[PDB]
Enzyme design. Structure first.
Site, short mmCIF file in Angstrom:
data_model
loop_
_atom_site.label_atom_id
_atom_site.label_comp_id
_atom_site.label_asym_id
_atom_site.label_seq_id
_atom_site.Cartn_x
_atom_site.Cartn_y
_atom_site.Cartn_z
N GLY C 19 0.80 -1.16 -0.17
CA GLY C 19 0.12 -0.11 -0.07
C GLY C 19 0.83 1.24 0.10
O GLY C 19 0.55 2.24 -0.61
N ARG C 23 7.23 1.76 1.28
CA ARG C 23 7.58 0.39 1.69
C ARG C 23 7.81 -0.19 0.35
O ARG C 23 8.46 -1.38 0.04
CB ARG C 23 6.53 -0.25 2.22
CG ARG C 23 6.00 0.03 3.85
CD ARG C 23 7.23 0.02 4.66
NE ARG C 23 7.67 -0.82 5.75
CZ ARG C 23 8.41 -1.15 6.74
NH1 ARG C 23 9.34 -0.11 6.73
NH2 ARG C 23 8.60 -1.98 7.32
N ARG C 42 2.74 10.84 -9.16
CA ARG C 42 1.99 10.93 -7.99
C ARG C 42 2.70 10.72 -6.83
O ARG C 42 2.17 10.47 -5.61
CB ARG C 42 0.34 10.11 -7.91
CG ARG C 42 -0.66 11.05 -8.24
CD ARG C 42 -1.95 10.13 -8.73
NE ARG C 42 -2.74 10.85 -9.42
CZ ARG C 42 -3.56 11.74 -9.36
NH1 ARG C 42 -3.41 12.30 -7.91
NH2 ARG C 42 -4.19 12.27 -10.06
N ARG C 86 -0.20 -8.75 -3.50
CA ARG C 86 -0.38 -7.74 -2.38
C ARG C 86 0.36 -8.28 -1.13
O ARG C 86 0.20 -9.28 -1.00
CB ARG C 86 -1.76 -7.31 -2.13
CG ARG C 86 -1.67 -6.40 -0.82
CD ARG C 86 -3.17 -6.19 -0.51
NE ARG C 86 -3.28 -5.80 0.78
CZ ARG C 86 -3.11 -4.75 1.48
NH1 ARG C 86 -2.41 -3.81 0.62
NH2 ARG C 86 -3.12 -4.58 2.76
N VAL C 87 1.13 -7.36 -0.51
CA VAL C 87 1.99 -7.41 0.49
C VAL C 87 1.72 -6.33 1.50
O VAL C 87 2.58 -5.23 1.23
CB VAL C 87 3.43 -7.79 0.31
CG1 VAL C 87 3.63 -8.90 -0.47
CG2 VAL C 87 3.99 -6.62 -0.55
N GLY C 88 0.99 -6.29 2.41
CA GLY C 88 0.67 -5.28 3.36
C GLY C 88 0.56 -5.68 4.76
O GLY C 88 0.54 -7.30 4.96
N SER C 89 -0.23 -4.88 5.59
CA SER C 89 -0.59 -5.34 6.98
C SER C 89 -2.19 -5.32 7.17
O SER C 89 -2.94 -5.01 5.98
CB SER C 89 0.17 -4.41 8.08
OG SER C 89 -0.48 -3.09 7.96
N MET C 178 -8.20 -2.97 3.43
CA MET C 178 -8.64 -2.19 2.66
C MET C 178 -8.44 -2.27 1.15
O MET C 178 -8.54 -1.29 0.42
CB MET C 178 -8.66 -0.38 2.93
CG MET C 178 -8.72 -0.32 4.26
SD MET C 178 -8.71 1.42 4.59
CE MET C 178 -10.02 2.02 4.51
N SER C 201 -0.60 -5.77 11.97
CA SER C 201 -0.17 -4.46 12.59
C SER C 201 -0.74 -4.44 14.07
O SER C 201 0.17 -3.73 14.83
CB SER C 201 -0.65 -3.40 11.89
OG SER C 201 -1.96 -3.25 11.51
N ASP C 202 -1.92 -4.79 14.42
CA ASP C 202 -2.57 -4.95 15.91
C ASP C 202 -3.67 -5.48 15.97
O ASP C 202 -4.27 -6.00 14.76
CB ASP C 202 -2.72 -3.43 16.13
CG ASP C 202 -4.18 -2.94 15.51
OD1 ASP C 202 -4.44 -2.88 14.38
OD2 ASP C 202 -4.94 -2.34 16.19
N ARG C 215 7.00 -6.13 14.20
CA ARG C 215 6.63 -5.86 12.89
C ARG C 215 7.66 -5.90 11.63
O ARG C 215 7.66 -6.22 10.54
CB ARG C 215 6.19 -4.16 12.84
CG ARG C 215 4.88 -3.86 13.54
CD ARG C 215 4.15 -2.71 13.10
NE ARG C 215 4.76 -1.54 13.57
CZ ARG C 215 4.39 -0.83 14.95
NH1 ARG C 215 3.32 -1.23 15.42
NH2 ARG C 215 4.85 0.36 15.28
N1 LIG Z 1 -6.46 -1.85 11.80
C1 LIG Z 1 -6.72 -1.64 10.41
N2 LIG Z 1 -7.93 -1.35 9.86
C2 LIG Z 1 -7.90 -1.27 8.53
N3 LIG Z 1 -6.98 -1.44 7.58
C3 LIG Z 1 -5.74 -1.41 8.31
C4 LIG Z 1 -5.49 -1.64 9.60
C5 LIG Z 1 -4.35 -1.91 9.83
C6 LIG Z 1 -3.49 -2.02 8.78
N4 LIG Z 1 -4.48 -1.78 7.85
C7 LIG Z 1 -3.98 -1.47 6.33
O1 LIG Z 1 -3.25 -0.32 6.16
C8 LIG Z 1 -3.99 0.63 5.26
C9 LIG Z 1 -4.42 1.77 6.00
O2 LIG Z 1 -3.70 1.82 7.33
C10 LIG Z 1 -4.93 -0.17 4.59
O3 LIG Z 1 -4.61 -0.17 3.08
C11 LIG Z 1 -4.97 -1.52 5.29
O4 LIG Z 1 -4.51 -2.65 3.95
N1 LIG Z 2 -12.10 11.50 -16.11
C1 LIG Z 2 -12.02 11.08 -14.79
N2 LIG Z 2 -12.79 10.32 -13.95
C2 LIG Z 2 -12.85 10.09 -12.65
N3 LIG Z 2 -11.84 10.88 -11.94
C3 LIG Z 2 -10.95 11.87 -12.39
C4 LIG Z 2 -11.46 12.10 -13.95
C5 LIG Z 2 -10.38 13.03 -14.33
C6 LIG Z 2 -9.89 13.60 -13.14
N4 LIG Z 2 -10.23 12.70 -12.15
C7 LIG Z 2 -9.81 12.93 -10.57
O1 LIG Z 2 -8.55 12.50 -10.53
C8 LIG Z 2 -8.32 11.48 -9.82
C9 LIG Z 2 -7.76 10.02 -10.50
O2 LIG Z 2 -7.48 10.43 -12.05
C10 LIG Z 2 -9.56 11.34 -8.97
O3 LIG Z 2 -9.16 11.52 -7.68
C11 LIG Z 2 -10.60 12.43 -9.49
O4 LIG Z 2 -10.66 13.36 -8.35
#
Ligand SMILES: Nc1ncnc2c1ccn2[C@@H]1O[C@H](CO)[C@@H](O)[C@H]1O
Ligand SMILES: Nc1ncnc2c1ccn2[C@@H]1O[C@H](CO)[C@@H](O)[C@H]1O
Ligand SMILES: Nc1ncnc2c1ccn2[C@@H]1O[C@H](CO)[C@@H](O)[C@H]1O
Ligand SMILES: Nc1ncnc2c1ccn2[C@@H]1O[C@H](CO)[C@@H](O)[C@H]1O
Ligand SMILES: Nc1ncnc2c1ccn2[C@@H]1O[C@H](CO)[C@@H](O)[C@H]1O
Ligand SMILES: Nc1ncnc2c1ccn2[C@@H]1O[C@H](CO)[C@@H](O)[C@H]1O
Lengths: 231, 231, 231, 231, 231, 231
Positions: C19, C23, C42, C86-89, C178, C201-202, C215
């Site tokens: 994510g 990392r 970005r 995917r590799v995350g927590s 998520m 993570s917790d 961790r």
């Molecule tokens: N306690 C939590 N609740 C929801 N998401 C969590 C956790 C702990 C880790 N993540 C992961 O980290 C990202 C947002 O922190 C998210 O992208 C997710 O993959």
């Molecule tokens: N043509 C599109 N369809 C959907 N999102 C678009 C656009 C054009 C710009 N955005 C905005 O840019 C971010 C992802 O590109 C998004 O965070 C959004 O705010």
């Protein structure tokens, strides 16, 4: 058109939309010169007259989304109405919305399925026409009338047991009525302009009612603001 | 707070919210005096500086409702932020929304389930703060910048196969982005003020892209309008 | 492709998906020989390098379904990626999921509407590729690393008030993150192979946090398991 | 318990679950030493016997989620059953799922509202027990039996007019039956172990039926794989 | 037809539909002259015989909407059945529904998604054929048998944790079973005639069971009423 | 009560409910001896009088579920009304529903969210009171008036673009109006008795209108049938 017994041309480009067909009389009579009564179908009276030389029609809508949807459709399709302005009351759901305030709805939340039927997975947020909204805002401030601008809640059931207006109040929603989502949506679909302007009949969450004198006052203000909302 | 590595006080009462953390740099660098970089967690940079003597922070949000929801929560709860203004682009879904227009979102439609999870049977229509909205409107007109005021569409999927933005375009929605519903809702829940201001990156329905020069221009306008939107 | 600034061929058949774009650096730097940085759009960095002679790319995804969905689409369509890991927590939602365990998600539950938009009345249960799943399982057992195999929960809101993870915990779900539902679904749609591997993570339900040393350890294990998951 | 006319202890820790109560006979008779018939309620026969010295019960479930849900509940709550293994057929929805393949369901999609009633806004993805899944996988490979591991689709209506299995096939789903989501969910809720193993009765999308001889063969394989799936 | 092993003509224009295939025997044996057993597929026995010279078939359906839906489809499409009458029991959810009452369902509520899949935003209320309903009513009154006429509740899960039958009881619903919505809907779709007639096995909300003697009695009444329901 | 300006006792135990407040006049005037007008609030007139010595009130409801729900609530709670009989028209959706037929609704389908808000995952099928239904049926047959008994469809939008009444027609539904689901549900909730009786204003699917003379006739029949529906 089935529900409105008017002939072509009898209805103005601009129409005010009180829920109550008898408030549709009172408005037309107490505010307009040279009144006509174009519709008497169902006792949902429509009137056309003039205010400051200009044509302004006033049509009763009835209560609830389905009712107003009928009239707002025919008014648009059958009589090419350009400007639609609802003028009614609402119950307030916040302490900081005061009984003398006049509400201009930017948007409306709803539990009506009218939108979900059309869209499915999309929460469609209706939208007031920003021109009509601005003009009303200006018209209120110019004369010093107190005005709150935010969202409202179009309900389907007046007496809701499963009432989530407790949760909506926390999200900022100013009060609850039963038409705006319809007006705003149908106006937007057909490329017309709409706006709801609403007085506060009572607070729903504190039970507290407003005295009849306060209603007469802010009712009058609403209609004045309405009447300047054009151009 | 978990996702923002800032200390108390380093973040302004007012924060601009570009999706792109590198546009968060460019803004802070090209527009503010005495920049600081409070956050570097995840590379989602936050900066605090001054514009005309006044503190203005600038925080990147990332893409999509879940991402911006994380930052908008922590910014509010953990750093008591009063004013939140998203500044990003959107794809336009109407011919009459022009590539030079600058969009102020009154409201936002969404297919995100973030609201339906909280409410159930209610379509919750989010709402921009009318004060921040007016000020931006005025600030645009005073300087002569072209401005459209209406609704937008917060999508969950950038590449939507089941794309109903064809139906939304018919209802007046001006364009599609992926954050506003989140901003407006979380702001409203916690009693803060929000507004999205958006440039037009392209037309989605005519495929037609906008030239990089036009983007630079209206990008600059957006940020100017932003910077006057307060008081 | 709009969001990834790479040229044809710069991206491996196999990509790891943390994510956190920082990392994504740390992994590529601390584990791969002859690193390149193909994307800086970005600040969501992508890197291509080798591990044991073989090409392995590492791309940051961002937080939430919409974000990862953007990258997973472009990686597949525009750069013909065959294997996505995917590799995350994640936060654990059960007492019997231990802080040192490494989680391989067979499937994922979600409150994201991404699937309901595509299907309507069908609960679509995403699915890890059983080959990539087995290989990771074997790779963990061969080296003696503790491993739990079950389902997870892809949330839309990090800070959920209406949190039903209390009910999900009772049905066996191991923890909440998520992204996974997105990865698994988009991979499956386009006939590619995906798998989420997650550290803890917790614990969310006992509040209890894990120490930074634990961790570092299980983070390292995850990446080792990852790196053997192919063939 | 209301639907099963067995006395305490007559039912094994491990139960096989064919939809057809007459296939429940055939299995028990053709594969187990020292058969008993504990249940004859509704003609949904249950049998307990031994295979390689060990107790194995075999209970018919009937067709559809509601039916199997009844038996899987009582088997668990009233007779403390530890291992539940469905063994039935399914219609295949892909060309690359071959008539001789034996399917082990990792997960199941569904249009049954059984889960949405319990969860609301969450798509709950059921999950096979990975131990029982692995053991069956190994048991198949050790003897050289062809095996596909992926997801399935638990339908409510055998004759679906609004059939979206065309869309599900595109997402990788291997075939359609009418029980698994129930088994997997109820097992998981009560902390038991489940797995569906399924033969292919026909291809639904090419209409093509399988010859009775092929059915006899893979039916036999399924039951062998079943019988080794423990420990 | 796949699930019914009968030849053309062996099945009557009128079929009774007990859930229990062994009650399908008992009925056919204890009430009809010159019984045949046309189906033994799955042990879901069907019988054709005569009562007062006239042909009456009796087919077991199994438990739950999916099961009965299979048989009701094939009975209609493959054997052109004109009249379908379910005869089973139900748990009562009101104090004023007495253990000796015999229930004729005008309509049925459901949490099965079978209808929502077909319709989407429409609550489809199934409907008994008023002719078959009247005839049964008359037939009961003529002989003095006590009869309640109202709605019922077709459940998907026999053991519902999220049981809203507390709320349904308040709206007048007489009791809960697991088939009627299916029968009524499929009958109506194909232009056939259906009716459910149900005895009361117990009260669900007072726990109170009915004695076996009372069941034998009202079971017999049901079948008599059934047998006169034609013409 | 807010919407009805009547004093205790002025309203009969039995009330007829035409949508049109002017048909509420015409009925009361053309059919009852010693008329009174208890309500003139909103111009939704209520009248109390006698027919064959007995008290019968007649109240206009307005159009749509929300409107009738208001009156049906207050009539029940505030004036203890025992019998509520809607008498209005409907558009027919089948060829075999003839323009002279008089419809008695056993049940009603709906796209109104009024029920889904109260129940969630349950399709709640409303239900006419079988006593009031029988009496009307008898009263029609005794005098030889043609009568169809089946289901109807309570719509929210008179002008539905997403019109599924094509699918509903196939399932047997006789025609579409906009109140019955409300009446039947609210009556049932509070333990009162309701029935809708409806004439056919036109065929919706063949466009074909009915001549004014046919309307006068069957309108009269409806009211006669109504007036005998008690005891
Ligand atoms: N306690 C939590 N609740 C929801 N998401 C969590 C956790 C702990 C880790 N993540 C992961 O980290 C990202 C947002 O922190 C998210 O992208 C997710 O993959
Ligand atoms: N043509 C599109 N369809 C959907 N999102 C678009 C656009 C054009 C710009 N955005 C905005 O840019 C971010 C992802 O590109 C998004 O965070 C959004 O705010
Ligand atoms: N407290 C409330 N709850 C719901 N609606 C309310 C109020 C107060 C006023 N209104 C408005 O009046 C009509 C029905 O009374 C409705 O049309 C509505 O606009
Ligand atoms: N083509 C199909 N569509 C749906 N279900 C099918 C098939 C083929 C087999 N099954 C399984 O058999 C039972 C009903 O025939 C069901 O219990 C199911 O497990
Ligand atoms: N208390 C209850 N709850 C749900 N279903 C019940 C009962 C009592 C009887 N039935 C009927 O019997 C079958 C399952 O027992 C079902 O087919 C159903 O018709
Ligand atoms: N063709 C139609 N579609 C929908 N509603 C119709 C008709 C015909 C009559 N009605 C009834 O009349 C009222 C609105 O016209 C409504 O209250 C309704 O009862």
């Amino acid at each position: 058109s089935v529900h409105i017994g008017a002939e072509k041309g009898q209805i103005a480009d601009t129409v005010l939309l009180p829920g109550d067909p008898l408030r549709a009389k009172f408005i037309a009579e107490t505010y307009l010169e040279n009144v006509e009564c174009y519709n008497e179908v169902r006792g949902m009276y429509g009137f056309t007259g003039t205010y400051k030389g200009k044509k302004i029609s006033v049509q009763g809508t009835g209560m609830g989304v389905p009712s107003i949807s009928i009239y707002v459709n025919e008014l648009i399709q059958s009589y090419d109405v350009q400007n639609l302005i609802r003028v009614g009351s609402c119950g307030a759901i916040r302490k900081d919305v005061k009984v003398r305030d006049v509400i201009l709805a930017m948007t409306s939340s709803t539990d009506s399925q009218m939108n979900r039927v059309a869209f499915g997975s999309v929460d469609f947020a209706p939208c007031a026409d920003f021109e009509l909204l601005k003009n009303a805002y200006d018209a209120a401030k110019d004369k010093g009338v107190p005005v709150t601008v935010g969202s409202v809640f179009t309900a389907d059931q007046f007496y809701n047991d499963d009432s989530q207006i407790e949760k909506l109040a926390k999200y900022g929603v100013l009060g609850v009525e039963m038409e705006t989502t319809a007006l705003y949506t149908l106006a937007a679909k057909h490329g017309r302009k709409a706006l709801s302007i609403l007085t506060v009949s009572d607070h729903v969450l504190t039970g507290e009612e407003t005295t009849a004198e306060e209603r007469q006052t802010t009712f009058h203000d609403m209609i004045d603001v309405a009447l300047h909302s054009v151009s």
